Amino acid sequence: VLSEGEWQLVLHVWAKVEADVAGHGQDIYIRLFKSHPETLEKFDRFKHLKTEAEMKASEDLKKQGVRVLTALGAILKKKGHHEAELKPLAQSHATKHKIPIKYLEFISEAIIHVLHSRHPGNFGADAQGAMNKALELFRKDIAAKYKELGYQG
Ligand code: HEM
């Protein structure tokens, strides 16, 4: 469980993401796909993209990263009281998309990397620790839901 102060460090960097969620989503996907190329294979609509240039030029990938980061932002704004938001996300990710916990760890690492590069004003050591705690909570709670749903993760 995160303290209020830790949540405020999470929300204060998220406020900067929200100046341009689409651009942050593009940087996070490009980071994820370059660092862990196997993750791109889970996206039927995007697995043909061959280069960072193609990923940046994809209007559909840009829209997807706005949907993904906005869903994450809604979770983080609940400050751990995210049961309702996790239910549909867990169900789709366990049963339709089949996204292992290790891949949620990879996207968490990409989110952290991008915030570290873009936002040193709001993403010093303490703020990064708070964001990691929040992402670790998310992944713990998703993994519990996965198990209830029948998926190993
Ligand atoms: C912070 C973690 C993540 C969040 C908040 C998130 C959120 C979302 C949301 C809101 C959608 C659309 C609704 C739905 O189908 O549930 C979606 C779709 C999808 N997500 Fe996730 N996602 C996350 C991580 C991942 C990761 C790591 C992968 C794969 C490695 C993944 C694969 C997919 C796929 C394949 C779809 C369908 C994409 C399409 O329509 O073309 N997601 N995600």
Describe the structure.
- This protein has 153 residues and is mainly α.
- The chain has a single domain (1-153), classed as Globins (Globin-like).
- It is built from seven helices and no strands.
- It has helices at residues 4-17, 21-35, 52-57, 59-77, 83-97, 101-118, 125-149.
- Helix 2 crosses helix 6 and helix 5 (83-97) crosses helix 7 (125-149).
- The longest helix has 25 residues, at 125-149.
- It is globular, with a radius of gyration of 15 Å.
- Bound molecules: protoporphyrin IX containing FE.
- Protoporphyrin IX containing FE (HEM) binds at residues 39, 42-43, 45, 64, 67-68, 71-72, 89, 92-93, 97, 99, 103-104, 107.
- Protoporphyrin IX containing FE binds at residues 39, 42-43, 45, 64, 67-68, 71-72, 89, 92-93, 97, 99, 103-104, 107.
Say what oligomer this is.
Answer: monomer
The number of distinct β-strands equals 0
Strand content: under 5%
CATH class membership? Mainly Alpha
Bound molecules: protoporphyrin IX containing FE
Considering the protein shown, what is the CATH homologous superfamily?
A: Globins
> What structural class do you assign from the helix and strand content?
mainly alpha
| Named CATH architecture | Orthogonal Bundle
Helix content: over 70%
Sheet having the most strands: none
Our Rg estimate from Cα atoms comes to: 15 Å
Number of helices: 7
SSE succession: HHHHHHH
CATH topology: Globin-like
Shape: globular
What are the salient characteristics of this protein?
153 residues; mainly alpha; Globin-like; binds protoporphyrin IX containing FE; heme; Globin-like_sf; transport; Myoglobin; peroxidase activity
